[PDB]
Amino acid sequence: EACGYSDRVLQLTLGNSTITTQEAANSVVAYGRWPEYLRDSEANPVDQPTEPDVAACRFYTLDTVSWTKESRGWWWKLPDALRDMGLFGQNMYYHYLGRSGYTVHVQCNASKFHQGALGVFAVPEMCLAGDSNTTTMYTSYQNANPGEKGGTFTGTFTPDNNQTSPARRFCPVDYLLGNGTLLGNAFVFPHQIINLRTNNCATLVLPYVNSLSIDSMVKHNNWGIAILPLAPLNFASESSPEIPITLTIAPMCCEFNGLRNITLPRLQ
Amino acid sequence: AATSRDALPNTEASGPTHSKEIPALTAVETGATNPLVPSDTVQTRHVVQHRSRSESSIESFFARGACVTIMTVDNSASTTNKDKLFAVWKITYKDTVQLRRKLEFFTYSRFDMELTFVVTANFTETNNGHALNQVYQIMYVPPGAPVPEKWDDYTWQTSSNPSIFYTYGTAPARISVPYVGISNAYSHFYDGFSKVPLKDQSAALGDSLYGAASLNDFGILAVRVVNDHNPTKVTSKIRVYLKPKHIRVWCPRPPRAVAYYGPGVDYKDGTLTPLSTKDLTTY
Amino acid sequence: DKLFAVWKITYKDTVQLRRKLEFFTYSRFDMELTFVVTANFTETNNGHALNQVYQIMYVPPGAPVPEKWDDYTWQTSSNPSIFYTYGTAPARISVPYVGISNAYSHFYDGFSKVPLKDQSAALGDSLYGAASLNDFGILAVRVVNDHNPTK
Amino acid sequence: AATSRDALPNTEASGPTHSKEIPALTAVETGA
Amino acid sequence: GAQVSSQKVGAHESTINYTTINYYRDSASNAASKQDFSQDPSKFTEPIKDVLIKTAPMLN
Amino acid sequence: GAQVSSQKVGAHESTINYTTINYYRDSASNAASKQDFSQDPSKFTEPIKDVLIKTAPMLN
Amino acid sequence: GAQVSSQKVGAHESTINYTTINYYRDSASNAASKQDFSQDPSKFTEPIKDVLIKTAPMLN
Amino acid sequence: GSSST
Amino acid sequence: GSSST
Amino acid sequence: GSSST
Amino acid sequence: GLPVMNTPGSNQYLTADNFQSPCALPEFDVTPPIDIPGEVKNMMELAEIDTMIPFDLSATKKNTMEMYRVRLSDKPHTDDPILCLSLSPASDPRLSHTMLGEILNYYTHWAGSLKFTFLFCGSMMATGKLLVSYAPPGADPPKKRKEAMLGTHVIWDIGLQSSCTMVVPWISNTTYRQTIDDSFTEGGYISVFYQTRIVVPLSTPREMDILGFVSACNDFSVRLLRDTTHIEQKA
Amino acid sequence: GLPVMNTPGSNQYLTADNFQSPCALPEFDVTPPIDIPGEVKNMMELAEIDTMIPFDLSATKKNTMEMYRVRLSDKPHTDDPILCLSLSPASDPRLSHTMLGEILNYYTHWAGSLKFTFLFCGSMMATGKLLVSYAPPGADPPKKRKEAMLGTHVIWDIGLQSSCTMVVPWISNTTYRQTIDDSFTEGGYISVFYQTRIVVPLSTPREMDILGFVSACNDFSVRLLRDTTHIEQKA
Amino acid sequence: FCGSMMATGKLLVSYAPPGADPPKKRKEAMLGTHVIWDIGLQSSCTMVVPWISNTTYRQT
Ligand SMILES: CCCCCCCCCCCCC/C=C\[C@H](O)[C@H](N)CO
Ligand SMILES: CCCCCCCCCCCCC/C=C\[C@H](O)[C@H](N)CO
Ligand SMILES: *C(=O)CCCCCCCCCCCCC
Numbered sequence A: 001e002a003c004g005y006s007d008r009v010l011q012l013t014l015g016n017s018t019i020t021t022q023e024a025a026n027s028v029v030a031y032g033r034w035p036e037y038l039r040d041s042e043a044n045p046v047d048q049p050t051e052p053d054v055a056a057c058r059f060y061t062l063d064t065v066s067w068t069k070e071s072r073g074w075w076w077k078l079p080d081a082l083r084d085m086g087l088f089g090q091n092m093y094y095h096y097l098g099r100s101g102y103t104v105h106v107q108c109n110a111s112k113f114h115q116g117a118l119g120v121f122a123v124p125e126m127c128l129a130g131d132s133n134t135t136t137m138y139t140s141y142q143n144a145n146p147g148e149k150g151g152t153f154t155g156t157f158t159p160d161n162n163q164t165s166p167a168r169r170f171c172p173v174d175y176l177l178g179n180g181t182l183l184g185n186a187f188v189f190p191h192q193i194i195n196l197r198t199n200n201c202a203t204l205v206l207p208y209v210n211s212l213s214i215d216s217m218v219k220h221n222n223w224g225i226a227i228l229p230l231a232p233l234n235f236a237s238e239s240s241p242e243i244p245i246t247l248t249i250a251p252m253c254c255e256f257n258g259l260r261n262i263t264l265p266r267l268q
Numbered sequence B: 001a002a003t004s005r006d007a008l009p010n011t012e013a014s015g016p017t018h019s020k021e022i023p024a025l026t027a028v029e030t031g032a033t034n035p036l037v038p039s040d041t042v043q044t045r046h047v048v049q050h051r052s053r054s055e056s057s058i059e060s061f062f063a064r065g066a067c068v069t070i071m072t073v074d075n076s077a078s079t080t081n082k083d084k085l086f087a088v089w090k091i092t093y094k095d096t097v098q099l100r101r102k103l104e105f106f107t108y109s110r111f112d113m114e115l116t117f118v119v120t121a122n123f124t125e126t127n128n129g130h131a132l133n134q135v136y137q138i139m140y141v142p143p144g145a146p147v148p149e150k151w152d153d154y155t156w157q158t159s160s161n162p163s164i165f166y167t168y169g170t171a172p173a174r175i176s177v178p179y180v181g182i183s184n185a186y187s188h189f190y191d192g193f194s195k196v197p198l199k200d201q202s203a204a205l206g207d208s209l210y211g212a213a214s215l216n217d218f219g220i221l222a223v224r225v226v227n228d229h230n231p232t233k234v235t236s237k238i239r240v241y242l243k244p245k246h247i248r249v250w251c252p253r254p255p256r257a258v259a260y261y262g263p264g265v266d267y268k269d270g271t272l273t274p275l276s277t278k279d280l281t282t283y
Numbered sequence C: 001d002k003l004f005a006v007w008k009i010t011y012k013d014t015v016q017l018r019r020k021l022e023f024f025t026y027s028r029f030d031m032e033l034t035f036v037v038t039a040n041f042t043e044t045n046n047g048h049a050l051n052q053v054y055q056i057m058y059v060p061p062g063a064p065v066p067e068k069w070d071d072y073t074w075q076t077s078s079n080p081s082i083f084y085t086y087g088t089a090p091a092r093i094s095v096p097y098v099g100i101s102n103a104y105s106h107f108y109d110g111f112s113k114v115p116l117k118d119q120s121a122a123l124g125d126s127l128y129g130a131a132s133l134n135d136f137g138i139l140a141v142r143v144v145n146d147h148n149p150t151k
Numbered sequence D: 001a002a003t004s005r006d007a008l009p010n011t012e013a014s015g016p017t018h019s020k021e022i023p024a025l026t027a028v029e030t031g032a
Numbered sequence E, F, G: 001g002a003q004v005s006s007q008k009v010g011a012h013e014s015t016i017n018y019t020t021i022n023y024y025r026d027s028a029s030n031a032a033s034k035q036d037f038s039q040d041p042s043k044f045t046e047p048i049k050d051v052l053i054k055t056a057p058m059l060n
Numbered sequence H, I, J: 001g002s003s004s005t
Numbered sequence K, L: 001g002l003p004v005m006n007t008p009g010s011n012q013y014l015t016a017d018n019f020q021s022p023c024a025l026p027e028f029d030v031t032p033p034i035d036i037p038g039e040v041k042n043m044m045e046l047a048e049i050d051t052m053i054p055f056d057l058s059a060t061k062k063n064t065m066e067m068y069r070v071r072l073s074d075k076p077h078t079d080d081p082i083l084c085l086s087l088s089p090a091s092d093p094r095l096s097h098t099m100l101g102e103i104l105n106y107y108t109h110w111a112g113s114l115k116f117t118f119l120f121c122g123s124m125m126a127t128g129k130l131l132v133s134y135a136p137p138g139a140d141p142p143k144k145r146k147e148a149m150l151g152t153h154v155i156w157d158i159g160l161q162s163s164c165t166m167v168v169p170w171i172s173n174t175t176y177r178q179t180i181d182d183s184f185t186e187g188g189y190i191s192v193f194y195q196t197r198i199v200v201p202l203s204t205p206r207e208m209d210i211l212g213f214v215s216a217c218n219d220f221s222v223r224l225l226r227d228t229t230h231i232e233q234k235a
Numbered sequence M: 001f002c003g004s005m006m007a008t009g010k011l012l013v014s015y016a017p018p019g020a021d022p023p024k025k026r027k028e029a030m031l032g033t034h035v036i037w038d039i040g041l042q043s044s045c046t047m048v049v050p051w052i053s054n055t056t057y058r059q060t
């Protein structure tokens, strides 16, 4: 635009929160569908829904992780990563049912002299593979759900050989996208790439996706966020560079049904 | 209104170019694929395109019966340490690999299911003897109905369960079933658990398998030889073929790249090297 | 092992239809295939076999050819198969004009490879008059039944 | 004219209430 | 109740048609019509918020 | 003498119809149409002589 | 969707006709109509650039 | 001839 | 319906 | 009666 | 003859099929119907009739008349449950044998709203307020009034209208639930508490029974017909 | 009865047939669809999405993340190839596992135009010009820029538009190619060269990666459905 | 921002209305009114502290 508007410079405002960026690579709307509230013709639970609106549909920043030459990748699940985030988390644990869309904003700046590229993927039903070759489908609820800290990918599959006290955790191998399919094909999922010379962030607007209009947020994650180094971090001639990666995520058009007493999960 | 059997777009003739229009240059970071066609980067002639994508419509891609299981039954005398063998199979497409991999190009699906049954029998013992033509009963028992415990017990009465009585040597049996899911679509992947572990509850009590939803998702097929036994032993097998008709699919996925290892997405050590050696600058 | 059969689809293994088609250089047609199936006992013994079912699987160039009568390829999720019951009417299917050219070539005066000077003779070599090595694929046929004591 | 395959009645939206209308209270002795 | 549709004719020897009658009350019993629609790949190939013009810079 | 009715279509790939011809003189030989009616449960759920208004006291 | 054509009648006992309905979507499944055309042999029998008049000298 | 339902 | 040849 | 597609 | 090609399914017998077949008694003079009272058109009509719940299946009360009686008394207020029940209408032992439970055991799937009605059978002189609760699944099942109050509930005041109804609204993730015990399609928790206490004057019984009934609402339906486990035939 | 004559094909089971058959669950109440995002109507839609190429299948890089990275450096100009690839999208080991390659392995025949897009992942300070080439088959496969330039090509200038696309136009003798290695239906040669050289200032990495993607154009189609060799089930 | 053009960074500027523990960690500050500032050519960034008060005027 001759008034200066740019593909690269954006402002997102949800609730009492605003994100600015000056080095964006446009932004993605997954499957071309913007988030929406549940329509009457698709509705299923009959009780009046709660719609917390600005109290929950706002940007929550998770703990910042660190990208280094040895990093194999990171993953998070939604809504799990937001289970402890203000009134969104509260609404989630107080209700049997809940649905939500999200704006995901991944942040990672560096310099004109650094290089590297992060693949940022939003995967519907991101089922990951377990650490076991003695029992399949054995990852425990506690290990499947890290909350905001997320998990990581590994370059090596290593089977849990403790049969007495199994680890019961995932063992997500990076080139196999943590799920037995090739990473080079993850681009069929809604994605952006943070290539440090080009941009310093990724923005993905995710609709609620499921085979149901609404479901148990506590039992089921709708989306997975997978961040993998497609091209490794590098800087000048330093052997041990580091740059931070920050995740900020906002729920959108979230509504809840089936109010009762609060859920108190076994998370450890 | 564009149909699957319509011809694809014609190539339009294009000549030399020298401008500020830059189709070839792009930025994959955006998450988009550059929509180019040959006339954007080379000189083209006019071609009237007749080819179509008719055979790769979702319906056409799936319009085939695939074997999902082999059930074994026999017609032997039940004796104190061993009974006449009837078969019980939990309905699924995950016991075999080929249809499973095709459905798993997608996250969710809706379809009407066509099941076709191929039935073959043979003698197992040496003796001369004979058997007369067998009739088979394929009974569907849905989650909650009494599963048969003996080849001849009351459950084979089927007052409400659907059964097929198939006569050996006649055309393979076939039935259709509608979209029977308890959700708006079948989930090929469920990133969740069927139970929330509560703190106030024992770990055992809150536990459940990762990625599993209803323990008896679709029920069972129970198959038996209806005939009484012969002096001679005859073993039979029922091969089940599944075809998804009237199908819709959502959310594409990368296909399975390493061997299947159970009903989930798990993989086995030693099978994780799909790709083969090939040098970067070797054609 | 139990014997299953594999045949490279062609009209050139027999002579009569071949000679008729070869009155012409090129052709287009829809192909109708009909299958007549006959069985017999080979050993002397008395015994018996129950009625056989046969699987005729089409495997097109590139699909896994079966190595054993009972391996995973007979699952046929995508290849077309006919399950034929012994003693019923001969099996039959139709196929459209499936050529990768605008017509079938009954004669191809050429090679599938150009021998280049910068390449070894072995590397540039190919049979005279042959085009695609696996032109139309194979039919793989098996008896689906398990074995009898009698052959 | 209501057929076996007709959809069942829609749920109508309803809000808070404070009145002499007492749907919840009843008397099963009546046989109803 | 017969449905008459046209065939797309491949090899040739007007429009040739074929006939179909459904014999059963349940649509699940029907054969597949194969009369399917195509859609544009955009939701997967161009999921970006701002419409892409291919001759223009993707980043401006 | 063909009877043409519509199917209620569940999973999808206009109105789809199906055809039925009765081949026999005796109605007992016919298939079941499954075109059935529903009725209100009142004769069992509210068999009371005085019409029940649910917002009112059942006993007045 | 029925196609009604005439038979050429050989031995006799009006026009006698026969009926054909295509049962399948793919034209490849159809029977052969045998309603074929003839052409003149000229492209093989007289492929010469200058039209031949048979009463005239072929070489002039 | 035909009846329609 | 019908075609005539 | 008949439908045409 | 007309050229025909036999398709798969030929000569099979599907017990759920729906074909014509020849009549063995041609031109039989059928007796006309008469207008018998009580005609039923759909099994859900029966599911909408209230039937009584066998709540107290203790070892000594089960399979006796006592199983239908829930004993209350005029004891001091407590926040402890009078009764606790799982909303698994075909599989919980207290619901599976009600008319609703029985019909649901001939089907694989159920959906819709239900309602529980309680009848107070103490003397006219007895008064009391009770809290009837429905907690949708996913949290700790209520064992104290404190938790039960936070879910769907009705505070019942005992008086001339002898009975009170709590509607269990259809609140589910899936569009239909399974008619067996299944965690994925679990329905949640029904419970009853003392809101104040039962109070009686002198010369009055200090203990009494309440009876409970369950029935389906007009939005309730079932599907996928199946055999029941509620009857068998050994030998 | 109506006189009929059974034809060949009678009683067979063709797995590709398309017939009606009886419904085992008559009058079943089907759950309606909801508008789930991401519906696909044709497998070629997936083939038009860019997926990343495992170019470097060396013994130590294959089956690791490194296989997707093509290393460049600021070395002096050479006319020697950065990479060489055969246009055999279903059978060349670098293309056969891409999403396009995978879908093509369920079909016998492919036709149409393709496009390769490369992404430069060095620092902003790094500059360079590269030549991306497509040589239709029939001559010596290009091993020097001199030959590669004579075919279809794009000279890529590295800058703010991070990526560059070369379209491989449909140029074939046959109307469809086979999805296996076949000389008669061979597609030719894809290659990449240094046009000038990568140049960096001081304090900058002298080596970096480019990533490559392949996808189909709107004129691309496949036919003759078949099983893939890319999955098996031993025992 | 008064660093060099070569310096980059993202900062979070926060406003927490009164009544809870004053934020000493980003975790708490994020939950209130805030702006995530990306450093670049637009040198400066503004957070608006919206009038959020119990009383109609505050004391000075
Ligand atoms: C007389 C024989 C009747 C046979 C009736 C079978 C009815 C049950 C059909 C179940 C449908 C299975 C569909 C495939 C599997 C699921 O889609 C996946 N696990 C995803 O949910
Ligand atoms: C279930 C059985 C399916 C069988 C399908 C067979 C499909 C393949 C048909 C190939 C067509 C062969 C036509 C004859 C040969 C060629 O015309 C000549 N070599 C000339 O090119
Ligand atoms: C519409 O269908 C009216 C025309 C009827 C044409 C002839 C029907 C052929 C036999 C149909 C049997 C129906 C199967 C229950």
Ligand SMILES: *C(=O)CCCCCCCCCCCCC
Pocket: F001, F002, F021, F022, F023, F024, H001, H002
């Ligand atoms: C009404 O039925 C007029 C139309 C007739 C349509 C074709 C009938 C198909 C064969 C019917 C046989 C009747 C069985 C005794």
Ligand SMILES: *C(=O)CCCCCCCCCCCCC
Pocket: E002, E004, E019, E020, E021, G001, G002, G021, G022, G023, G024, I001, I002, J002
């Ligand atoms: C045009 O076909 C309208 C007239 C229909 C005449 C009766 C058809 C007889 C049965 C046709 C079955 C079609 C096979 C799928």
